[PDB]
Design a protein around this motif. Structure first.
Motif, PDB file in Angstrom:
ATOM      1  N   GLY A 146     -75.669 105.124 -29.715  1.00 46.99           N
ATOM      2  CA  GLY A 146     -76.096 104.176 -30.770  1.00 46.99           C
ATOM      3  C   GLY A 146     -75.160 104.204 -31.955  1.00 46.99           C
ATOM      4  N   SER A 147     -75.110 103.108 -32.698  1.00 47.94           N
ATOM      5  CA  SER A 147     -74.124 102.955 -33.752  1.00 47.94           C
ATOM      6  C   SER A 147     -74.387 103.888 -34.941  1.00 47.94           C
ATOM      7  CB  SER A 147     -74.131 101.493 -34.200  1.00 47.94           C
ATOM      8  OG  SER A 147     -73.984 100.629 -33.082  1.00 47.94           O
ATOM      9  N   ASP A 148     -75.593 103.851 -35.489  1.00 46.63           N
ATOM     10  CA  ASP A 148     -76.023 104.851 -36.467  1.00 46.63           C
ATOM     11  C   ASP A 148     -76.791 105.971 -35.789  1.00 46.63           C
ATOM     12  OD1 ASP A 148     -76.464 105.679 -39.398  1.00 46.63           O
ATOM     13  OD2 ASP A 148     -78.522 105.573 -38.651  1.00 46.63           O
ATOM     14  N   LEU A 149     -77.707 105.548 -34.948  1.00 40.63           N
ATOM     15  CA  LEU A 149     -78.724 106.401 -34.360  1.00 40.63           C
ATOM     16  C   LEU A 149     -78.721 106.315 -32.837  1.00 40.63           C
ATOM     17  CD1 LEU A 149     -81.817 106.323 -36.744  1.00 40.63           C
ATOM     18  CD2 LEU A 149     -80.132 108.113 -36.320  1.00 40.63           C
ATOM     19  N   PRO A 150     -79.203 107.382 -32.167  1.00 41.08           N
ATOM     20  CA  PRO A 150     -79.212 107.499 -30.697  1.00 41.08           C
ATOM     21  C   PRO A 150     -79.962 106.347 -30.023  1.00 41.08           C
ATOM     22  CG  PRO A 150     -80.638 109.148 -31.716  1.00 41.08           C
ATOM     23  CD  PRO A 150     -79.771 108.585 -32.797  1.00 41.08           C
ATOM     24  N   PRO A 151     -79.721 106.132 -28.713  1.00 41.84           N
ATOM     25  CA  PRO A 151     -80.089 104.890 -28.023  1.00 41.84           C
ATOM     26  C   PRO A 151     -81.577 104.566 -28.110  1.00 41.84           C
ATOM     27  CG  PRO A 151     -79.552 106.633 -26.456  1.00 41.84           C
ATOM     28  CD  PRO A 151     -79.066 107.082 -27.801  1.00 41.84           C
ATOM     29  N   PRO A 152     -81.873 103.266 -28.203  1.00 40.95           N
ATOM     30  CA  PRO A 152     -83.200 102.739 -28.476  1.00 40.95           C
ATOM     31  C   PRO A 152     -84.055 102.582 -27.227  1.00 40.95           C
ATOM     32  CG  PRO A 152     -81.432 101.151 -28.998  1.00 40.95           C
ATOM     33  CD  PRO A 152     -80.918 102.173 -28.035  1.00 40.95           C
ATOM     34  N   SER A 153     -85.357 102.585 -27.434  1.00 46.75           N
ATOM     35  CA  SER A 153     -86.307 102.321 -26.372  1.00 46.75           C
ATOM     36  C   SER A 153     -86.545 100.818 -26.301  1.00 46.75           C
ATOM     37  CB  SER A 153     -87.622 103.061 -26.664  1.00 46.75           C
ATOM     38  OG  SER A 153     -88.673 102.628 -25.810  1.00 46.75           O
ATOM     39  N   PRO A 154     -86.931 100.290 -25.125  1.00 46.22           N
ATOM     40  CA  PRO A 154     -87.258  98.874 -24.995  1.00 46.22           C
ATOM     41  C   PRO A 154     -88.423  98.520 -25.907  1.00 46.22           C
ATOM     42  CG  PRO A 154     -87.033  99.891 -22.831  1.00 46.22           C
ATOM     43  CD  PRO A 154     -87.026 101.004 -23.838  1.00 46.22           C
ATOM     44  N   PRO A 155     -88.392  97.318 -26.496  1.00 44.57           N
ATOM     45  CA  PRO A 155     -89.292  96.951 -27.588  1.00 44.57           C
ATOM     46  C   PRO A 155     -90.754  96.909 -27.177  1.00 44.57           C
ATOM     47  CG  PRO A 155     -88.104  95.026 -26.803  1.00 44.57           C
ATOM     48  CD  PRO A 155     -87.477  96.219 -26.142  1.00 44.57           C
ATOM     49  N   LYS A 156     -91.607  97.319 -28.096  1.00 47.79           N
ATOM     50  CA  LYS A 156     -93.043  97.237 -27.915  1.00 47.79           C
ATOM     51  C   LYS A 156     -93.572  96.122 -28.808  1.00 47.79           C
ATOM     52  CE  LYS A 156     -93.104 102.259 -27.226  1.00 47.79           C
ATOM     53  NZ  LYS A 156     -91.726 102.510 -27.734  1.00 47.79           N
ATOM     54  N   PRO A 157     -94.823  95.660 -28.600  1.00 47.82           N
ATOM     55  CA  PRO A 157     -95.446  94.632 -29.449  1.00 47.82           C
ATOM     56  C   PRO A 157     -95.304  94.946 -30.936  1.00 47.82           C
ATOM     57  CG  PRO A 157     -96.887  95.130 -27.617  1.00 47.82           C
ATOM     58  CD  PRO A 157     -95.723  96.078 -27.507  1.00 47.82           C
ATOM     59  N   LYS A 158     -94.266  94.396 -31.545  1.00 48.46           N
ATOM     60  CA  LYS A 158     -93.955  94.645 -32.942  1.00 48.46           C
ATOM     61  C   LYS A 158     -93.392  93.393 -33.602  1.00 48.46           C
ATOM     62  CE  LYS A 158     -94.975  98.871 -34.295  1.00 48.46           C
ATOM     63  NZ  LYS A 158     -96.005  99.093 -33.248  1.00 48.46           N
ATOM     64  N   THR A 159     -94.087  92.938 -34.628  1.00 49.53           N
ATOM     65  CA  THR A 159     -93.659  91.798 -35.421  1.00 49.53           C
ATOM     66  C   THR A 159     -92.822  92.285 -36.604  1.00 49.53           C
ATOM     67  OG1 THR A 159     -94.410  89.681 -36.390  1.00 49.53           O
ATOM     68  CG2 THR A 159     -95.637  91.669 -37.010  1.00 49.53           C
ATOM     69  N   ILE A 160     -93.041  93.563 -36.948  1.00 47.43           N
ATOM     70  CA  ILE A 160     -92.460  94.251 -38.073  1.00 47.43           C
ATOM     71  C   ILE A 160     -91.051  93.785 -38.447  1.00 47.43           C
ATOM     72  CG2 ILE A 160     -91.687  96.092 -36.502  1.00 47.43           C
ATOM     73  CD1 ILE A 160     -92.825  96.602 -40.106  1.00 47.43           C
ATOM     74  N   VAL A 161     -90.838  93.758 -39.758  1.00 51.06           N
ATOM     75  CA  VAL A 161     -89.572  93.385 -40.389  1.00 51.06           C
ATOM     76  C   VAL A 161     -88.382  94.164 -39.798  1.00 51.06           C
ATOM     77  CG1 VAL A 161     -89.570  95.114 -42.248  1.00 51.06           C
ATOM     78  CG2 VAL A 161     -88.643  92.822 -42.688  1.00 51.06           C
ATOM     79  N   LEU A 162     -87.184  93.881 -40.285  1.00 51.63           N
ATOM     80  CA  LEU A 162     -85.977  94.319 -39.613  1.00 51.63           C
ATOM     81  C   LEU A 162     -85.146  95.240 -40.472  1.00 51.63           C
ATOM     82  CD1 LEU A 162     -86.771  91.799 -37.882  1.00 51.63           C
ATOM     83  CD2 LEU A 162     -84.319  91.490 -37.521  1.00 51.63           C
ATOM     84  N   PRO A 163     -84.654  96.319 -39.857  1.00 54.99           N
ATOM     85  CA  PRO A 163     -83.654  97.190 -40.435  1.00 54.99           C
ATOM     86  C   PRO A 163     -82.238  96.751 -40.028  1.00 54.99           C
ATOM     87  CG  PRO A 163     -84.979  98.300 -38.717  1.00 54.99           C
ATOM     88  CD  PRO A 163     -85.070  96.809 -38.548  1.00 54.99           C
ATOM     89  N   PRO A 164     -81.544  96.059 -40.949  1.00 55.13           N
ATOM     90  CA  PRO A 164     -80.183  95.495 -40.772  1.00 55.13           C
ATOM     91  C   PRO A 164     -79.098  96.493 -40.325  1.00 55.13           C
ATOM     92  CG  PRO A 164     -80.852  95.536 -43.078  1.00 55.13           C
ATOM     93  CD  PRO A 164     -82.083  95.666 -42.255  1.00 55.13           C
ATOM     94  N   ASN A 165     -79.446  97.769 -40.235  1.00 54.80           N
ATOM     95  CA  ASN A 165     -78.522  98.820 -39.810  1.00 54.80           C
ATOM     96  C   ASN A 165     -78.049  98.597 -38.379  1.00 54.80           C
ATOM     97  OD1 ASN A 165     -81.522  99.858 -40.448  1.00 54.80           O
ATOM     98  ND2 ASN A 165     -81.029 100.032 -38.278  1.00 54.80           N
ATOM     99  N   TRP A 166     -78.730  97.711 -37.680  1.00 51.44           N
ATOM    100  CA  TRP A 166     -78.519  97.519 -36.265  1.00 51.44           C
ATOM    101  C   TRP A 166     -77.224  96.848 -35.952  1.00 51.44           C
ATOM    102  CZ3 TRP A 166     -81.077  93.202 -38.511  1.00 51.44           C
ATOM    103  CH2 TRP A 166     -80.602  91.949 -38.108  1.00 51.44           C
ATOM    104  N   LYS A 167     -76.790  97.152 -34.757  1.00 50.30           N
ATOM    105  CA  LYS A 167     -75.574  96.636 -34.228  1.00 50.30           C
ATOM    106  C   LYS A 167     -75.806  96.005 -32.865  1.00 50.30           C
ATOM    107  CE  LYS A 167     -73.256  97.796 -37.773  1.00 50.30           C
ATOM    108  NZ  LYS A 167     -72.916  96.714 -38.732  1.00 50.30           N
TER     109      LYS A 167
END
Length: 56
Positions: A1-22
């Motif tokens: 991962g770019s900042d942080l280790p690899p992500p899990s597949p998304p769960k039911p989440k509408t939640i706002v966004l952390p722009p840190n993503w790549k």
């Protein structure tokens, strides 16, 4: 991962966004975007904010 280790597949989440993503995708010449803090990966959700283009 770019900042942080690899992500899990998304769960039911509408939640706002952390722009840190790549963005990066599977070998099938595709691209997706994964958020490093929240540890999410999403191909369809929009950027929630506009960078230097809108706000400097």
């Amino acid at each position: 991962g770019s900042d942080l280790p690899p992500p899990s597949p998304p769960k039911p989440k509408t939640i706002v966004l952390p722009p840190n993503w790549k963005t990066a995708r599977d070998p099938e010449g595709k691209i997706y975007y994964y958020h490093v803090i929240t540890r999410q990966t999403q191909w369809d959700p929009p950027t929630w904010e506009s960078p230097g283009d809108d706000a400097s």
